Structure 1
Amino acid sequence: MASAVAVDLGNRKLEISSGKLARFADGSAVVQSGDTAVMVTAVSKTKPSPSQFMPLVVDYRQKAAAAGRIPTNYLTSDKEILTSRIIDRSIRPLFPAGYFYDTQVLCNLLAVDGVNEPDVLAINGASVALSLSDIPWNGPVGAVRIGIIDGEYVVNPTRKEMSSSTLNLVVAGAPKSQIVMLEASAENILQQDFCHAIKVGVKYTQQIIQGIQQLVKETGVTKRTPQKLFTPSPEIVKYTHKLAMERLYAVFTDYEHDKVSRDEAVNKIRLDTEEQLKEKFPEADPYEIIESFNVVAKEVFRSIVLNEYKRCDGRDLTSLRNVSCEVDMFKTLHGSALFQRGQTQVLCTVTFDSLESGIKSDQVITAINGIKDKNFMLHYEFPPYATNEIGKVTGLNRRELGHGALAEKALYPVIPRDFPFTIRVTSEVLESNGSSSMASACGGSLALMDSGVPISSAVAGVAIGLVTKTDPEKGEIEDYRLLTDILGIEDYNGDMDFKIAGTNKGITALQADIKLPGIPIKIVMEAIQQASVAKKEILQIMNKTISKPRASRKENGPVVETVQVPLSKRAKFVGPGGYNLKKLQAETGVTISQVDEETFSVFAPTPSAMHEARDFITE
């Protein structure tokens, strides 16, 4: 059934419709602004997943690069992966607990006008497809981007407006002005401006929700009745609580635990408990018995934070873990640093590469991820040994890409323009116990100064967590504790992973992963203020190992040199089709580029490389 509604920006209209395209899907929708149009579908199986969790995947795909100008579908980009993840975070929290059904959300860019951004359209598209579908989902959600252009707050800024915005904030909101997801990149802006952007953004999401609710009412939606919701019965939970509460409370009030000892201790309680349940309730099911212990471990864990204002390691609500750092770890590295916060350890390196390396030989491949502004990028890895695990170490890793992008944008505003080399930061998490991406931003800041990049200011980030008590009637929050710098266990037993970074004066990045079906604006405002205190604490300790850029780049650093070649010798110098230069580059790792008729510029990664190149060229 064709249906359509327009939502006023008010500056620009959002056109939402459904009922013409892809009508076999459980849900489908198209969202258009200007001449950009996105279709989103939602499909969810009726048979339970072999998984003992909800398998949800979001796939946002584009058909061309560079504002829809360079066709690419005939042949995964960064943009696609990051956009998929943003949509995922905007919808995941609103599925019912126990909904273990294979569910897929796909996005099709029907048309892109190079002016109106399709990413935000797709988030809204997912919301309306789910809303109009028979899939249980506690929405609707509405989403907008907020920019700050020439001093003004602009909703859903055009691509041109974005290029001069000091803010790239995306907000997804649920009814009653609850925040479901916050994603932002900012030019080191004032907390007060950042926070006002959030409130404006939320306002607009509520308008979009109103439009969606109209659409739902016209469509006459009847949700499916899932075969089963896999939540443990109140009986098995109550009993489990009886059996394990005292041991769990003991474990969680023992401050001498570290990550590993604490986990092994709850695991011991789990094994015993889980076997005593198997007997009391022989009527199956191992997975439900497993669910029950997790529910109880979680509740005991949280009740202590709520009742005693103490955390399982003895910290205050606002205390940072101990931090230590070092720069200049290894002599040959252009810059490096080790950043340790509690049992989270990341090693960061900077490497200067040629300006040329920011571009691939193939035009269309280049267009895909584009050329990094300031010729600056950060690559993040989370290898399996960081958690004493075994894992795949090849291929596309979406989480690593997302985390890298987060730490990259945290750092991006302090990077100088017109640096003579490409700046590559590598962040590698060697030990993991919470907020590796925020440690990557910190480590990156230290290594960048070590390397002698004159960054404008140091950068640090931290994760804020959340524990709530909500009435069983409505989902309404009757009490809550914000946690500074959360342990792994506080993330998984907690309600959010609110990662925010910036300088001593402003905010550069935010990624709020919220696991409740939305939270009040007041809670996120407080989270931001609380993180601001911790950030400054991290910066003070960071500034004691290094507080300004090395006054030059290191001895071992790259060098650029200009080489004159007379026409008489060009043909021999370059070789047929430039073969000599290509061979020179492969063999010495230098990068040569012809500047004019007689002039060639040589980038060498080290003085040793240049020497070797000077000898290969000295024929």
Structure 2
Amino acid sequence: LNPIVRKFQYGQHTVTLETGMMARQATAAVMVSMDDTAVFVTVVGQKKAKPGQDFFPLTVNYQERTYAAGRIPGRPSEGETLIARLIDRPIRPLFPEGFVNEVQVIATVVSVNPQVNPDIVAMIGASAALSLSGIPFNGPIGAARVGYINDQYVLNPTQDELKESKLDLVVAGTEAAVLMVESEAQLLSEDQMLGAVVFGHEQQQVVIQNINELVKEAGKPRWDWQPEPVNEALNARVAALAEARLSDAYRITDKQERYAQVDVIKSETIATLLAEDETLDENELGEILHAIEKNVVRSRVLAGEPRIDGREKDMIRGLDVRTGVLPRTHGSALFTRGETQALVTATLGTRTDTFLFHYNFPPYSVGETGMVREIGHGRLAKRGVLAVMPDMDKFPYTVRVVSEITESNGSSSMASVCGASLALMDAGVPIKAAVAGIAMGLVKEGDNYVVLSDILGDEDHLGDMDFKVAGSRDGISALQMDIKIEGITKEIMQVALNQAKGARLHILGVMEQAIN
């Protein structure tokens, strides 16, 4: 039994990567350690994907052991699944197009230095393990937390350094790109936020470098996977009789009339092929039509044509703000933007831990049935309001906000930030200033790129980069980003954030006008 260690300094802290001695049956496993906070990360990738499949089964697990802090207790906890998401987000888009083999990443914290948060350490481990595994993965990736103290950027600030920080942000990217950003801020500017992202992305390059060396020394041979064929002949004679007819069908304004022409196009086209050949699995055929359709829309947006509902790239849907909606609640509000709506409440009684945010996403919000996601959205919406909350001494009452997503087709989470803002004011909570959220999208093709404001549910495919921003008129309180494409520069981000600031301000304008 012989371990392979690789050590390096990651600004102020020493990071060690040990592999080859533990869990040798996993596809690859790494014990990442950073100044006494150790997370053992493992990875298993099934060798053969089910027949056809049609869906990449990627699942990350983050477990925190209480013995890791020298304590005896007396799931998974929501916080644990939040960090699992923090790891899943950046690595998920790096798996090649077509890879549908099951992959499970398990991260479990084995030792904890109360000053060094296990999260980025676990992210580092998942990147190392995945890279060493040889599973088709276009990594590695780095991970960094950026703080803001004395108006200067800080690299991986300790838990108490954060007490004097005005920013808590996490960025993860490869060598040439930022993939995901998750943050909470005390009303900073897009420019300051952008600087944290770029700073972090650069500072973490040290990590991607070491992982690379370790892969040279201990890495396994890259799988000889192979994408698995695409019937580019079938979906060639599908586009042959639908492509053009559809690009025209998308020019007719009457919404319900557009579906008709499309449905005709999809009906005629399928029947015509089932007559040429046959036994062609309509399902797959319809699956191809849906694709040239999503591309017809992608081509129209890039060309400057109206979005699917008629809006232009910067248009926000119709707002509607109502306060004091429920009789016996300390504070209620009904914020609705287009087709996504949120009923929000505030209750008081004898910061966070003093501030509680709960999110509910019933199935009827999307006109469906099902059991009665609301976990990651809740944390985002909470970060979006944190900046505005009173100093506890200014308001000695624990406050709890609850959001009911009654409608959804845009971004329930951003909508619940606005409702929370309103409800708290309706409850008499002395919040620093109203706060609002907006969900954006960025579609790109070569150099032609377009920023979208208030993305629809069915505009998700245009989100080569979809991001959320929340704050008041004076600054950004929360910023979340997820990039799945390359290119997209810091300059392009500046543009994107600016258009998002506009949308925010527009929404605040309507909000401030509601609560006179």
Separation in structure 2 between the aligned mates of residue 441 and residue 251 of structure 1, nearest angstrom: 37
- Partners of 1:287 and 1:136 lie apart in 2 by 29
Kindly state the Cα deviation for residue 333 of structure 1 after the two structures are TM-superposed.
Answer: 1.6
Residue aligning to 1:412: 386
Once residues 231 and 163 of structure 1 are traced to their aligned partners in structure 2, the CA distance between those partners, rounded to angstroms, is 53
Alignment TM-score, normalising by the size of structure 1: 0.78
1:328 aligns with 2:324: yes
Instruction: Give the Å deviation of 1:95.
Output: 0.8
Does structure 1 residue 499 correspond to structure 2 residue 468?
yes
Residues 194, 490 of structure 2: 8 Å contact kept: no
Change over 3 Å in CA distance of 1:375–1:265 after alignment to 2: farther
Provide the rounded CA distance (Å) in 2 between the counterparts of 1:104 and 1:168: 28
Provide structure 1 residue ranges, at least 5 long, that are not aligned to the other structure: 356-371, 394-398, 470-476, 548-619
2:293 match: 297
- Tell me the CA shift for residue 332 of structure 1: 1.4
Task: Check conservation: 1:93, 1:518, Cα contact below 8 A.
Answer: no
Secondary structure of 1:128's partner? helix
**Conserved? CA contact 2:64–2:110, under 8 Å:** no
- Cα deviation code 1:37-82 (max 9, x no counterpart): 11211112122246421111111110129x935444x881122011
Structure 2 letter corresponding to 1:375? T
Report the Cα offset of residue 231 of structure 1.
6.3
| AA in 2 matched with 1:406 | L
Q: Deviations over 1:68-123 (max 9, x none)?
A: 35444x88112201100111101011111221111111002121111111100111
- What amino acid is the match of 1:24? Q
Structure 2 unaligned residues grouped into runs of 5+? none
Of 242-251 and 325-334, deviating more is 242-251
CA contact (8 A) 1:254 1:312 kept: no
Q: 1:118 to 1:468 in 2, by over 3 A?
A: same
Q: How many residues align?
A: 512
Q: Structure 1 residue 230: deviation in Å?
A: 5.4
Kept after mapping to 2: 8 A contact 1:93/1:517: no
Q: Would the alpha carbon gap of residues 250 and 179 (structure 1) be closer, same or farther in structure 2, given more than 3 Å must change?
A: same
What CA distance in whole angstroms lies between the structure 1 residues aligned with 2:339 and 2:404?
14
Structure 1 residues 268 and 151 mapped into 2: Cα distance closer, same or farther (>3 Å)?
A: same
CA RMSD between the two structures = 2.4
Higher mean displacement: 154-163 or 78-87: 154-163
Contact 2:4–2:19 (Cα < 8 Å) also in 1: yes
* Structure 2 residue aligned with 1:560: none
Cα displacement (A) at 1:331: 2.0
If the length of structure 2 is used for normalisation, what is the TM-score? 0.92
Structure 1 equivalent of residue 83 of structure 2: 83
Secondary structure at the residue paired with 1:414? coil
Tell me if 1:310 matches 2:306.
Answer: yes
Q: Residues 462 and 265 of structure 1: is their aligned pair in 2 closer, same or farther, counting only changes over 3 Å?
A: farther
Displacement after TM superposition at 1:244 (Å): 2.0
Correspondence 1:172-251 to 2 at 5 A: 172-176=172-176, 178-226=177-225, 229=227, 232-251=230-249
Measured in 1, the distance between the counterparts of 2:238 and 2:91 equals 32
Q: Do 1:49 and 1:55's aligned partners in 2 also have CA atoms closer than 8 Å? A: no
Shift in alpha-carbon separation, 1:323–1:505, aligned structure 2, 3 A: same
Over the matched positions of the two proteins, sequence identity in percent amounts to 42
Q: Which has the larger radius of gyration?
A: 1
Q: Which residue of 1 aligns with 2:355?
A: 376
2:127 aligns with 127
How many Å separate the matches in 1 of 2:66 and 2:194?
34
Matched residue, 2:492: 523
CA contact (8 A) 1:406 1:437 kept: yes
For the 8 Å contact 1:32–1:38, the answer to whether it is kept is yes
**Pair 1:47-2:48 in alignment:** yes
C-alpha distance in 2 between matches for 1:506 and 1:262:
41
User: Where in structure 2 are the equivalents of 1:144-543 lying within 5 Å?
Assistant: 144-176=144-176, 178-226=177-225, 229=227, 232-257=230-255, 269-270=265-266, 272-277=268-273, 282=278, 288-352=284-348, 354-355=349-350, 373=352, 375-393=354-372, 399-418=373-392, 419-469=395-445, 477-516=446-485, 519-543=488-512
What letter is aligned with 2:40?
A: M
Aligned residues of 2:191 and 2:494 also touching (Cα < 8 A): no
Match of 1:400, SS state, is: coil
Per the alignment, residue 366 of structure 1 pairs with none
Change (3 A) 1:95 1:234: same
Higher alpha-carbon deviation: 422-431 or 7-16: 7-16
Q: Corresponding residue for 1:13?
A: 14
- Give the CA deviation at 1:291: 4.3
Q: CA deviation at 1:276?
A: 4.5
* 2:36 is the alignment partner of 1:57: no
Corresponding residue SS for 2:507: helix
Judge conservation of contact 2:422–2:434 (CA < 8 Å) in 1. yes
For residue 447 of structure 2, give the secondary structure of its aligned residue in structure 1: strand
